[PDB]
Amino acid sequence: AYTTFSQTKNDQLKEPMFFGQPVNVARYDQQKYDIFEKLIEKQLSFFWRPEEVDVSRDRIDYQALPEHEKHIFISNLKYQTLLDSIQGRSPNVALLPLISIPELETWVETWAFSETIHSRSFTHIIRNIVNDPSVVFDDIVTNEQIQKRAEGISSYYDELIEMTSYWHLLGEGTHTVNGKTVTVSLRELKKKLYLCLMSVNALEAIRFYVSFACSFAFAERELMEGNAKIIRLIARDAALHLTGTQHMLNLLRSGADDPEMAEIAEECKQECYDLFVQAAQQEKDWADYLFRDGSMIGLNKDILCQYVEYITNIRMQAVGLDLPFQTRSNPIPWINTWLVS
């Protein structure tokens, strides 16, 4: 029931963000929500090439680092890498089949594209700091610590994808498949999308930001300056990505775009709150392990932990959630020098 070109003539201004008629013509002269067109414009204007950044000196810097510090840096890098591997593909595979307005369709493809550039930049960095990149790459997949911090990300995307598949194939209803009963509900599928988006929002809003702090800590010490420039370029893109997810959720919860979504949003509030807290926790936990055999110069488990509570608070309010943590001022205001945005 999915089509690469819906032959029905339709007003693309009146379609909902998701689950309406698949987009046929790709036009950009008009939009139901211009924020999406603005996002495409800004992301294109931000286009950059990793190779164009010199990382010549990070190698010796990396190598002179104290062992515990090498670990901190590389684990963090490994984490960023995983996240972007997932982000390069997932929004395209997960959202495209359910988008009904073109500006959003294209924003998603542009956003996903920008994530591949991020992946490209990681290879660039790794290549220039270790002897055998394969050692780093191979550890991303099975690193117990990583799948542990990242746990649940692929699963939200994977379930939505499968549900989407059943929906498109079988349509809404109570069906049977090889002797088993399989129920398909548009409502359950909207829930899944909603929680999946909320989760990607955390991913962009919190997970990455925590990593930015771990990377910029080195920059503050004039260390890994190649990596730093890349991270800076990456953080500028994330702000945009963050903006898209926030608007999507806000338009969804606000009931303007899809009433049922507004409803749904309300019913899983507590569910979302918990999801958020869970993510803030994983990050804390990661932090607790990355700084066990030694803390770094200007960052430690406790500072990082405060940061996570700090930014989590801001992100959650930005999406109408209650604050889970004690309100406090930024505990590492020096980071603002790197977050050009």
Interaction between residue 4 and a copy of itself (CB under 8 A):
yes
CA distances from 260 to 10, 199, 202 (A): 22, 19, 23
User: What is the pattern of x (binds a copy of itself, CB under 8 A) and - over residues 25-64?
Assistant: xxxxxx---------x---xx-x-x---------------
> Which option in a copy of itself, Hg ion, Fe ion, none does residue 196 bind, with CB closer than 5 to 8 A by kind?
Hg ion
CB 185 within 8 A of CB 264: no
Looking at 149-272, which runs of residues are DSSP E strands? 173-177, 180-184
**Is the backbone of residue 83 left (phi > 0), alpha (psi -120 to 50) or beta?**
alpha
Classify residue 173 by its DSSP letter: E
Site for Fe ion in 22-51 (CB under 5 A): none
Q: Which is nearer to Hg ion, 30 or 330 (CB)?
A: 330
Residues 86 to 125: which contact Fe ion by CB under 5 A?
A: 115, 118
Among a copy of itself, Hg ion, Fe ion, none, partner that 241 touches (CB below 5 to 8 angstroms by kind): Fe ion
Residue 163 touches which of a copy of itself, Fe ion, Hg ion, none (Cβ within 5-8 Å per kind): none
Binding-site partner at residue 271 among a copy of itself, Hg ion, Fe ion, none, CB < 5 to 8 Å by type: Hg ion
List the single partner that 189 binds among a copy of itself, Hg ion, Fe ion, none, CB under 5 to 8 Å by kind.
none
Among 56, 67, 131, 176, indicate the residue that binds a copy of itself (CB under 8 A): 176
Rounded distance, CA 170 to CA 181, Å? 12
d(CA 91, CA 89): 6
Which window, 107-115, 211-219, 236-244, 258-266, contacts a copy of itself (CB under 8 A)?
107-115
Q: Which does 28 bind (CB under 5 to 8 A by kind): a copy of itself, Hg ion, Fe ion, none?
A: a copy of itself
In one letter, which amino acid is 114?
S
Measured at the CA of 23, the angle between CA 22 and CA 29, to 5 degrees, comes to: 160
DSSP string, 264-305: HHHHTHHHHHHHHHHHHHHHHHHHHHHTSS--BTTB-HHHHH
Footprint on this chain of Hg ion (rule: CB under 5 A): 72, 156-157, 195-196, 198-200, 210, 213-214, 217, 265, 268-269, 271-272, 275-276, 304-306
